Subunit: 431 residues, 4 copies
């Protein structure tokens, strides 16, 4: 089963990243084999959303948070003025662009606008959504979404210039949970807003709503965010409680694409340490996912597909598991081909090469997608331009530790230019 | 009738995959089964009053923990007396036994631990939570310090450091059960690795059929606040979903301002989480991993649990002298409540360590005809079950008994209709 | 390790196949009953004694040939051969008598007369030819008069309509026969295996007996050894889930009737050990609906307990055979030793795979619990004499809480002393 | 629905059996190859043409009987019949030499040399009892016989007991039930057959089920119920090939025997429970860093996701098609090759349909690869494998020559 690859890659490789637990035949055996001495090796795949506020607004502090692992900056429009939020956005952009001198240092960071909330779309939300479009935000976290028409109202308020902005619906009350299917259908993703949910429904039922919503989003292949009070005590203390570390680990094990920090980064005394703690827990929890059952169940539950991007994605993930591929390099214009690979939860990192700065920021919503922004002008021959981008992903991957000489990588491309034509999977040996 | 299959997450229970099971979990599907995960409450100034202890017993406290890292022997003797007074204040059909557990100060075996363990035997404690167990010889030392008079006391080894996790298998083999002592574990190993040690230890204890306790900071914010954080409710629910037999409260009940509410909160979460367990996979995996056995108690237990699942039995009523027959039923995680009828006050207290075991203390002297004595105890289990809401007329129950008096002879399973 | 136990412990069906071993000898008693057709080659009392010793459990009388007088003589000869072993408990074996009708536009006049002959001669089973719909079964049931309601009706599926209306036929029948001879002429020959596998699967799911019939060892009508396809066919019928396997021309007119019975016995024993019980039991459990019938609930608990301890046997007390049939439906590896006072139920339970009938004729004890104990001990002592059990073995015992049929609700684990 | 698709979607093997339907017609092309023994009843060119049309894929020459001159004439007649057949529909037919048997006999050395000189594709080596027997056959084939496939016949107790060492050095196995049924108890042959088929399926190597499959058809026009069951169960067991011996070599109904195996195999292939089979084969196949192996599992997974009508693969030696076949896709594996020997030999692998490419070469290697893929599509449409609107998976490599398969592409037809 694993004997030839154990001889080739070594016993040390197979003792890391919870690989003994990954090879177990049952979920019970998988738990029994989890090992505190089995170190994570893969890059952290669950994105961290940090709320920006008084403790995390300065350019110097934002540079530290980007280095600690922040992928998405959340602006809570329930507090502060438009002037206050515009300055936060400018500071985030200055900190992000301070690393732009090279693909080895650059890390795209998405900007998300979290609305104040509502009897339908409020007048303040209309003004805040217009502010978001004018300031080029990547994502909207829509507060108190209760039905599909609430999403349509947010979409209309973004106007024709905001068509590319992702709408993540926040489920915060009983109606949102009950009408979940209709809301998910029209949203780009979901946020389990546990703060309000824990007041709107009995506190002892929140975990059921969280697990159900994460499961349904995983089945739909749409991003899901777990939010609120994940590391709450870290607002005043340098180390979290045992329940808080457990909560972050279990959100990742449940299947969350993103985890969030609110007061921990907006007002707390340890914003950088809170990001570092979520980073450390998420890497441990990602390695502990039982991929054997998860991949089997995602295949069994997902309907058959005639979409070549979907068909190539499952073949690429299956191939990555067969050879313990270090990465899956994918070319993408909108992020969709990377999202379809992410839905099958590969252990291999999905390195997404794109010319779209906005798609590079938005793909942080999908677990395990590492965006690489390609800035070179197009080659005269399209096939050469595709090859250059694949080589850019390989060289960036090698220079950044994702790839090593001798590794196998899976490369996912399409047959013609433009979004929607991904249909090729190639197995390449890194030299 | 019809609403039965809507409740207790039964639509999610019938799912063909774990992913579909999650997708079918419903916040409107109310729990019906009695809460199976026992609650351990640490005794302290917030919970020493006899009147406060009566409220904690009513709220759901099953085991009272005495932390010997604080207070003198005189202090702990008063704690024991107050717990016993509150427990004995309670109507034999509704009486709830409450175990007393002694949690040692810790270290080899210290001289203070030798004195504290002798105090425990002299005061009749049921369980010892042995601190900082690092190897099998630590358990043997605790057992020797309990002496010949403490042979019946259960030893739960607390795993609190790297060595304890690494030598886990040898420790589990000689212990009655384990406690995942997350407080010290979270200081001894990186905080971000504690969940791995917790999940591994719970999985291994579930495989071994031995009790496992999840402990420390589960509802920490309720020491000062009336409602817990979202991470705390998640932590309690995930400990139950992981497979913990018991969950614990430390500062929340010993020194905080909401000891009764903290017990009520663990009770409420545990009931919701138990209904959300995917028994289809869990039972299949426990059966597959459990070795073949020639012990009639073990063979009867798996047959009884299989029968209970076939008919959606409301309960499995088992007669037990030491608690062993109830423990062997519990290891297969039936959805049916295991109602354990015993004359041993100590066994009635100790079986709270096993998930889904509801002990009933039978006080009547033995009937002259042994089959009549067995029947009267089964009827006592039924009448208690009806009064407490476990059973109703028309329910099916599985009754587990043995072929002769004395411990060790369980060998019969019977399907009974409640009249 | 014997009885394919290394293959039994495999985690996948593919691994199970890879671990099958020609040197792993079968130990369990043969569980699939053998039905032999009685005719010119197998009618004599001396030949019938050899067929009983070789393993024949059910004698089939084909009413498409011969007179009532001819068949009455065959029945008398079978009964004389069976009773010749009534002095030795080690060799006495009940043998069922099955009447196979000539067939039909509805119930034929000849079938009414032949079914009446069956009732008058005390036959145990009817193999009803060309059953095409539920009303055909109702007609056979009505023709079984006021005296034969206890006779089992096994519907023969022999044409396209019978296959298409299978669910309605199975619902009203006691069991099914896959009558491959006519089926292979009525539908394309290359589709018969699909109908066979589907019908066996559905009968296994319903917990009703299914017989695989016709041309299983055909070449043995003239040759002393079968072809490689014929041994394969018998083994695959057992692996498919057939409760019984049948011989027609091989025993009725062939030159090697005893050898044909011996060959089916030898193959069935090898094939039964090769069954992948791990998957079979899991799938039977998952597909069977929840039940509030204590006999059904006790049966699954007893089979689960037998697997847990590798029990040598499950001893069950039964008056009608129903408690043994409900144990058989879960396909335990342990032999189901059925202790009954009903001579008819003892003959009829041969239709259920793995049921070994023991006819008990002691007068009833005044104290019911003592009468139950005496019968359980009779099953144990017969099991020891026949090689099923030894001192130290574990056995599962299934009984009810009060006398009379329909109250099975107890499972006990006993250590043999 | 057709091709037992209701049974294919079942959640358990038991439910799969319950859903099998005699009215659900097979649509896929027959995947299990038929080996027919050539003899007096099937030697003529006219008879051989009818056998090729009926479905014969491999012609077996039994060197236990007849002279070298007799077998050379049989080979010439098979080749004349094959070459009588339109490049988009041409069907390659392999020639297999079945040795007399024993260490290596002097007669076998002469017969193996005859085989090399006459360009046989396969050797069915009789009575293989250990790895050194396979080495001796390989040595007797010499340097000119390097490309010939050796299928070891397991015929006795020793061969069964030393099976793993024999399989390791052989190209495949034949379950030679005739001798096996005399060497071991007849009632144990099914265990040896099921074990050997299971182990060959795990190893990804061809396995042949042989002897007395349709025996009664030597004198009768229709087989017995046990014979149709035997053929169906060999396919369900996982056999890559099924064989006819006396039925085609000396019987009165050789063509009808081939037609009967074709009809049963098609029905049995649709009745395979792919949901369990693919999951088990995928789980048991070892992890690998070989790009052909990695591409093969990705291609089979992709084919199942979209209900692909076919997987078109370019192959020089047949290896890339064999690695796809080992995962038992429901999609036909259309193997496009320029090697006539590889086209003949790939009949040993279930579900591989060889197409011998004889179109003019393109100047640009990438255009030449594209035209070979288009040839597979056009041939597929003509033969009924593909229709406009179908999805196909295409498996190719990054450079010319064997061993470089590393690409899988999803293509919509027309
Ligand atoms: O907070 C912790 C803790 C934190 C970090 C690492 C380990 C621990 C720990 O082990 C622990 C804790 C608290 C208590 S207590 O219930 O508050 N209490 C019982 C007795 C006294 C009282 O009656 O108040 C004082 C202590 C424990 O009993 C206990 O074991
Ligand atoms: O030759 C007699 C016979 C001769 C004189 C007086 C009585 C009989 C007689 O009773 C009898 C005979 C033959 C057959 S059979 O060859 O076993 N037959 C072949 C296949 C049949 C089928 O495809 O359905 C069913 C079975 C019987 O079944 C049967 O009972
Ligand atoms: O090769 C000839 C042949 C050559 C020259 C002159 C005459 C003949 C001839 O008459 C003949 C041949 C082969 C076979 S066979 O069917 O292959 N045979 C069946 C038994 C074995 C098996 O079960 O696998 C394989 C051997 C015959 O049956 C047969 O009659
Ligand atoms: O993930 P998306 O948005 O569908 O983009 C995938 C597209 O990227 C490509 O690989 C390259 O296209 P471009 O040259 O237009 O960037 C296409 O072949 C493919 O259709
Ligand atoms: O669970 P344990 O300690 O083995 O006790 C089970 C015992 O209880 C009984 O059911 C009743 O025994 P007693 O009448 O002695 O209480 C025995 O038949 C059986 O052996
Ligand atoms: O299988 P059946 O026909 O329902 O018979 C089972 C019956 O056998 C018994 O075990 C013994 O009953 P009898 O004493 O009347 O033979 C009953 O308790 C049970 O109801
Ligand atoms: O299956 P094999 O023998 O490895 O052949 C596969 C080879 O066929 C090809 O697809 C085409 O190669 P050729 O152009 O030499 O025919 C190669 O890219 C690949 O390596
Ligand atoms: O709005 C939120 O983020 C919440 O309620 O958790
Ligand atoms: O001792 C304890 O309970 C701990 O450290 O958690
Ligand atoms: O009647 C039968 O037995 C048959 O046709 O197979
Ligand atoms: O050699 C063979 O083919 C046989 O014996 O079956
Ligand atoms: Mg909110
Ligand atoms: Mg501690
Ligand atoms: Mg008839
Ligand atoms: Mg007929
Ligand atoms: Mg031979």
């Amino acid at each position: 089963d694993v004997a030839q690859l154990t001889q080739e890659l070594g016993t040390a490789f197979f003792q890391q990243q919870q690989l003994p637990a990954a090879m177990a035949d049952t979920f019970l055996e998988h738990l029994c084999l989890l090992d505190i001495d089995s170190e994570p090796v893969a890059a952290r795949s669950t994105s961290i959303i940090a709320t920006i506020g008084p403790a995390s607004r300065s350019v110097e502090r934002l540079k530290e948070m980007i280095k600690a692992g922040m992928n998405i900056a959340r602006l809570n429009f329930s507090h502060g003025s438009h002037e206050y939020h515009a300055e936060s956005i400018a500071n985030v952009r200055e900190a992000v662009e301070s690393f732009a001198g090279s693909p080895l240092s650059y890390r795209p960071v998405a900007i998300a606008l979290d609305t104040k909330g509502p009897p339908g779309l409020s007048e303040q939300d209309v003004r805040d959504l217009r502010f978001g479009v004018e300031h080029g935000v990547d994502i909207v976290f829509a507060s108190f979404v209760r039905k599909a028409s609430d999403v349509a109202a947010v979409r209309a308020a973004l106007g024709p210039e905001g068509h590319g902005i992702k709408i993540i619906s926040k489920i915060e009350n009983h109606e949102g949970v009950k009408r979940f299917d209709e809301i998910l259908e029209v949203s780009d993703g979901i946020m389990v807003a546990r703060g309000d949910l824990g007041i709107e429904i009995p506190a002892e039922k929140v975990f059921l709503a969280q697990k159900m919503m994460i499961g349904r989003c995983n089945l739909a292949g749409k991003p899901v965010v777990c939010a609120t009070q994940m590391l709450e005590s870290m607002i005043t203390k340098p180390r979290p409680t045992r329940a808080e570390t457990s909560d972050v680990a279990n959100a990742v094990l449940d299947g969350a694409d993103c985890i969030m920090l609110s007061g921990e980064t907006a007002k707390g005394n340890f914003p950088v340490e809170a990001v570092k703690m979520q980073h450390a827990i998420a890497r441990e929890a990602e390695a502990a996912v039982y991929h054997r059952q998860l991949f089997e169940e995602l295949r069994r539950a997902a309907p058959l597909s005639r979409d070549p991007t979907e068909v190539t994605a499952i073949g690429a993930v299956e191939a990555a598991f067969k050879c313990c591929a270090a990465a899956i390099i994918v070319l993408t214009t909108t992020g969709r081909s990377a999202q379809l690979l992410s839905r099958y939860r590969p252990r291999a990192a999905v390195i997404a090469v794109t010319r779209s700065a906005q798609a590079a920021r938005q793909v942080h919503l999908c677990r395990g997608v590492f965006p690489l922004l390609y800035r070179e002008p197009p080659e005269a021959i399209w096939a050469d331009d595709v090859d250059r981008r694949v080589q850019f992903g390989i060289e960036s991957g090698k220079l950044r530790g994702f790839l090593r000489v001798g590794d196998l990588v899976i490369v996912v491309t399409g047959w013609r230019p433009g979004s929607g034509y991904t249909n090729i999977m190639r197995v390449l040996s890194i030299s």
